[PDB]
Design a protein around this nucleic acid. Structure first.
Ligand SMILES: [Mg+2]
Ligand SMILES: [Zn+2]
Lengths: 126, 113, 63, 59, 176, 38, 104, 330
RNA sequence: AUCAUUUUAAAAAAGCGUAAAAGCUUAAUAUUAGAUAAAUUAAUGUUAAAAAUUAAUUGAUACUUAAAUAAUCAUAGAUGAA
């Protein structure tokens, strides 16, 4: 047909979720039924996803811990932050806004240090 | 059509009964009555309502004006100068923790019950 | 289906104290089952059986 | 004695709808359901085929 | 149904209250400094998680304004003991600025003066081609950040001029 | 912009927006696709 | 296909059911194209009147009906619902099948 | 031995640095001007409907003379309906001793609160008043927006003159009409409408401090830290809030019934956009000295007119090169 | 020409794209969570079964055939709303 000539760039507004992570540790009870599968999917998005938008030292794992109270998603960020989120009651959507509540701040911490943690504009167009 | 609305019927339903009714009277006299002989007008108006089994009623956006005073809708004397416009009462509750005990007393005490 | 349960829910309330009664329920409940084709396509597993043993557990003593 | 007289402004009464919600018991909470279709019967059932439409479509 | 989600930060701690009559339901947020309450109709049902500090809402009333109710509620709480942030850049030859105590001096090929003066903001320079703004309200920020943008913006032919650090940029060929 | 009584969508990205009695089309790719109804 | 090839080789013998079944339908149809099924169909309906005009019916979503008769027989014209009519098409057998109309 | 939900498992939750910890020696008002909060959403969202208040609109008074008085408050009925009955009472059409050939009229009119006027709909903004002034061109249109703010009193006096019969008796009638902007009239021996200044406090719905603590109950609480500002209330914690809507007993379930209701609620909110009050927004000042926002001193004349030599930094002062910090405290 | 295989599914492709290549998206599809599937009519009296039931409607959702109703816009002239 016709050739586009206006190039709309959307690389700088790209904000993936697992990008400021250094590690991860899935925890599973075989007695959960809602807290197992939620952690199944996260472990894929940590490895099935793309490595550009992750750190270089990102290592995700999975362990079956019968001793735990509930299946968990432990995580560790760059600048020191560390948390755990049990999964017998939650959703995959309630988790992501927590990750934004960290990832939105680490920018406010690292930009002040001078670090450009942003992407080129030419990475993804519309 | 204006002397009869003091008695809370309109013209149309008045004469509608007048022809139903036994009475022969003209629109001429009923004018002269309501001006010059008003008591007999209300007399004539009553049986006409009754022989037709009609039932008057006032318009429902009327008040017995004494009731209007009692509800503070209205005052006979002069008015006062209006106060400064109070800030709009918010739909949400907000403040600082350091003043809660001071704020509790105002809301508790005044409207405790 | 909704009203067979009302019947059997009632029979689970009225105990039987003779023997001709229990015979008079098996011979009737036999022919008068609720077929599976009238039931829905999606349903609790083997729910036709659970309709039975409410009776058969209610009869097993007397017979 | 009718002309001390007072009348009022106008009150708008808009009505929320009258049909109300139907809440329902949770019965299939901890239950797993399965289908009981027989694809054998479903295949054999000879249903209408729009042959007249299937002819024009050919060209 | 869309089941909207209410985030709560970690610094905040909350409670939930009802009558014996059960005809009233309301909720109470409380911090070291502030405190804030808001109710829920009889037609709004609610779910809570301490695991995430998130609250879930259904609405039998089917009011579409709630999607705005969220963003106000969410940002009004994160507006307590946290900033919002933004970053500005430029790329060009005869361009510069100078910074003196939240008073930014702009020289982008214009005959007139171009002072920027910040009432109740924070502005801290990280390099010649970069500056961050910080403020607790997001809506004043953009009005504060965009005035800088309107002096020069990105040419659609070359990415020369100012821009935000996260934005949709346009480009068009020229002089092949 | 160009005033088309009969509006029309050229690319899939075109979409409609209504500001009061006002109607128009806009595109995120080709800003020449946009229109108005008058 | 839906199972890996390595498992299908173990179960290659199973597919006789596939082909042994298609014997049954396609032969059954091929010989049952000729015969009318023995199943009675009925259509409740109402008489015609000069009152019920077309557009009156057509907001009520009824439909007129017309019958042409044969030697010595009178014609008959009736009223019925639309969804009856399309359901009468929706059989295989519509080109010839005998349909009844119960007025009373 | 099977899945039982735990009771006391929650870990610590990481505390972030505060702006004081991170940016001392800087303007406190940054982290104290909180985000805007539109009230008008709430009263629509969380279901506050003001009680229907039904104040007085007009009034008829007689005297031992023949003279009658007709009084109106233009903030309570619309403009037209106020203006129809004026022309019906100013003549004597309710007076059965009405001859239209009368050189004398014992009917007097008063109006009050002409500043605030009721106009149903989007009419205060769009409708206009036109006239021509003898000269070519001419044809001056004017908006209600001009009258309703600056001189709203021609308008009430202009619409009356259009309903009255076009004749020579008009001026004698319009000589007997009086209008006021305030809530008073200056006549004495007559009454005055009481204004309605109150505004409903909806405080009983979203505030425990209004209710007595023994009527209330706590169903849920986050921390073991209990506020001292909340003391005396029971704690009957539900096992039911934290359950999502599937794990409950009653589930709201989309269905032909509720979806039928959904569409009724949808029309309700479209059927209410029509019954909405529009307002003349006032003119505006843009004094940079008043606003809490940033601004520009593009030119020099913006300095003198506003005396902004202060906030401008002098030129005889050093600058700031780079303000990076590596370590972020905790 | 429209075959065939591997796949849980994937068109000798319904389209954009290239000097030709590369690259992008739909159809078809999976994991996880949320989530629609509800109401009925007519038949052989009772004996087959580690087992299997026909013809047919209305309705919720998506795809699809499409039409109708209601409002809005669809430029206006020449002494001045006209
Ligand atoms: Mg191929
Ligand atoms: Zn377009």
């Amino acid at each position: 047909g016709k050739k586009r000539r206006v190039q709309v760039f959307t690389g700088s507004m790209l904000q993936p979720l697992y990008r400021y992570l250094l590690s991860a540790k899935i925890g599973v009870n075989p007695l959960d039924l809602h807290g197992q599968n939620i952690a199944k999917q996260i472990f894929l998005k940590c490895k099935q996803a793309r490595p550009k938008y992750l750190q270089n030292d990102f290592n995700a794992t999975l362990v079956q811990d019968n001793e735990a109270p509930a299946s968990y998603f432990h995580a560790k960020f760059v600048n020191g932050y560390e948390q755990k989120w049990y999964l017998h009651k939650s959703t995959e959507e309630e988790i992501n806004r927590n990750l934004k509540y960290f990832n939105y701040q680490i920018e406010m911490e690292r930009n002040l240090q001078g670090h450009d943690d942003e992407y080129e504009d030419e990475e993804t167009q519309l | 059509n204006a002397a009869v609305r003091e008695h809370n019927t309109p013209y149309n339903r008045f004469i509608w009964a007048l022809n139903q009714s036994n009475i022969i009277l003209d629109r001429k006299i009923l004018s002269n009555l309501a001006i010059n002989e008003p008591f007999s007008f209300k007399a004539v108006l009553d049986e006409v309502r009754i022989q037709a089994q009609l039932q008057s009623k006032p318009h429902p956006r009327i008040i017995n004006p004494i009731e209007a005073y009692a509800k503070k809708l209205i005052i006979d004397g002069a008015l006062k100068p209006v106060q400064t416009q109070v800030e709009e009462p918010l739909p949400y509750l907000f403040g600082k923790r350091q003043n809660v005990e001071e704020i509790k007393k105002k809301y508790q005490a005044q409207v405790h019950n | 289906l909704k009203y067979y349960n009302l019947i059997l829910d009632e029979i689970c309330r009225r105990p039987i104290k003779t023997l001709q009664e229990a015979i008079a329920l098996l011979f009737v409940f036999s022919h008068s089952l609720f077929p599976n084709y009238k039931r829905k396509e999606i349903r609790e597993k083997d729910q036709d059986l659970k309709e039975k043993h409410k009776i058969v557990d209610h009869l097993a003593d007397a017979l | 004695s009718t002309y001390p007289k007072v009348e009022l402004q106008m009150v708008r009464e808009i009505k929320e709808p009258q049909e109300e919600i139907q809440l329902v018991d949770n019965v299939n909470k901890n239950v797993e359901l399965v289908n009981y279709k027989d694809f054998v019967h479903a295949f054999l059932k000879d249903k209408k085929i729009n042959e007249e439409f299937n002819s024009q479509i050919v060209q | 149904m869309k089941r909207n989600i209410l985030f709560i930060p970690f610094n905040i701690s909350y409670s939930y209250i009802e009558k014996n009559n059960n005809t009233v339901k309301f909720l109470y947020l409380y911090n070291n400094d502030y405190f804030f309450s808001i109710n829920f109709n009889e037609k709004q049902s609610i779910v809570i998680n301490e695991d995430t500090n998130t609250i879930v809402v259904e609405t039998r009333n089917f009011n579409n304004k709630i999607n705005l109710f969220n963003n106000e509620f969410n940002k009004f709480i994160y507006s307590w003991d946290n900033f919002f942030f933004n970053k500005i850049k430029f790329t060009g030859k005869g361009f510069k600025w100078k910074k003196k105590e939240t008073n930014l001096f702009l020289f982008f090929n214009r005959a007139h003066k171009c002072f920027f003066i910040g009432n109740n903001i924070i502005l801290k320079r990280l390099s010649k081609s970069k500056v961050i703004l910080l403020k607790n309200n997001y809506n004043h920020l953009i009005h504060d950040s965009i005035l800088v943008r309107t002096i020069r913006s990105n040419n659609i032919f070359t990415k020369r001029g100012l821009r935000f650090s996260r934005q949709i940029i346009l480009k068009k060929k020229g002089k092949t | 912009m160009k005033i088309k009584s009969a509006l029309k969508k050229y690319c899939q990205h075109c979409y409609i927006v209504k500001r009061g009695k006002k109607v128009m089309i806009k595109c995120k790719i080709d800003p020449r696709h946009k229109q108005r109804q008058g | 296909t839906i199972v890996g090839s390595q498992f299908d080789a173990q179960t290659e013998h199973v597919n006789k059911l596939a082909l042994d079944l298609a014997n049954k339908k396609y032969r059954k149809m091929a010989l049952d194209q000729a015969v009318l099924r023995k199943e009675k169909v009925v259509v409740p309906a109402e008489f015609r009147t000069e009152k019920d005009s077309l557009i009156s019916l057509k907001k009520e979503l009824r439909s007129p009906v017309y019958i042409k008769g044969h030697t010595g027989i009178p014609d008959v014209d009736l009223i019925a619902d639309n969804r009856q009519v399309f359901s009468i098409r929706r059989r295989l057998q519509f080109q010839n099948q005998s349909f009844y109309f119960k007025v009373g | 031995s099977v899945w039982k939900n735990p009771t006391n498992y929650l870990p610590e939750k990481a505390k972030f640095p505060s702006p004081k910890e991170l940016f001392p020696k800087d303007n406190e008002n940054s982290w104290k001007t909180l985000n805007d909060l539109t009230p008008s959403l709430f009263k629509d969202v969380q279901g506050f409907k003001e009680k229907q208040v039904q104040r007085a609109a007009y009034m008829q008074i007689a005297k031992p003379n023949g003279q009658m008085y007709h009084i109106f408050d233009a903030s309570k009925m619309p403009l037209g309906r106020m203006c129809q009955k004026i022309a019906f009472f100013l003549q004597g059409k309710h007076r059965p001793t009405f001859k239209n050939c009368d050189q004398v009229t014992y009917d007097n009119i008063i109006v009050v609160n002409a500043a605030n006027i009721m106009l149903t709909g989007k009419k205060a903004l769009l409708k206009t008043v036109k006239y021509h002034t003898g000269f070519v061109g001419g044809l001056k249109e004017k908006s209600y927006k001009f009258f309703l703010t600056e001189k709203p009193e021609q308008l009430v006096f202009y619409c009356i003159s259009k309903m009255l019969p076009k004749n020579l008796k008009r001026r004698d009638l319009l000589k007997k009409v009086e209008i006021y902007r305030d809530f008073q009239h200056e006549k004495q021996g007559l009454p005055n409408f009481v204004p309605y200044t109150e505004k409903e406090t909806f405080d009983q719905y979203f505030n425990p401090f209004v209710h007595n603590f023994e009527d209330l109950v706590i169903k849920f609480q986050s921390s073991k830290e209990t506020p001292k500002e909340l003391e005396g209330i029971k704690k009957e914690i539900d096992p039911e809030i934290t359950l999502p809507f599937n794990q409950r007993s009653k589930i709201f379930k989309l269905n032909a019934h509720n979806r039928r209701v959904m569409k009724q609620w949808k029309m309700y909110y479209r059927r209410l956009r029509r019954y909405k009050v529009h307002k003349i927004k006032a003119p505006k000042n843009r004094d940079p000295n008043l606003s809490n926002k940033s601004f520009m001193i593009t030119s020099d004349r913006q300095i003198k007119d506003f005396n902004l030599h202060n906030r401008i930094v002098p030129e005889e002062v050093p600058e700031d090169d780079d303000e990076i910090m590596r370590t972020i405290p905790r």
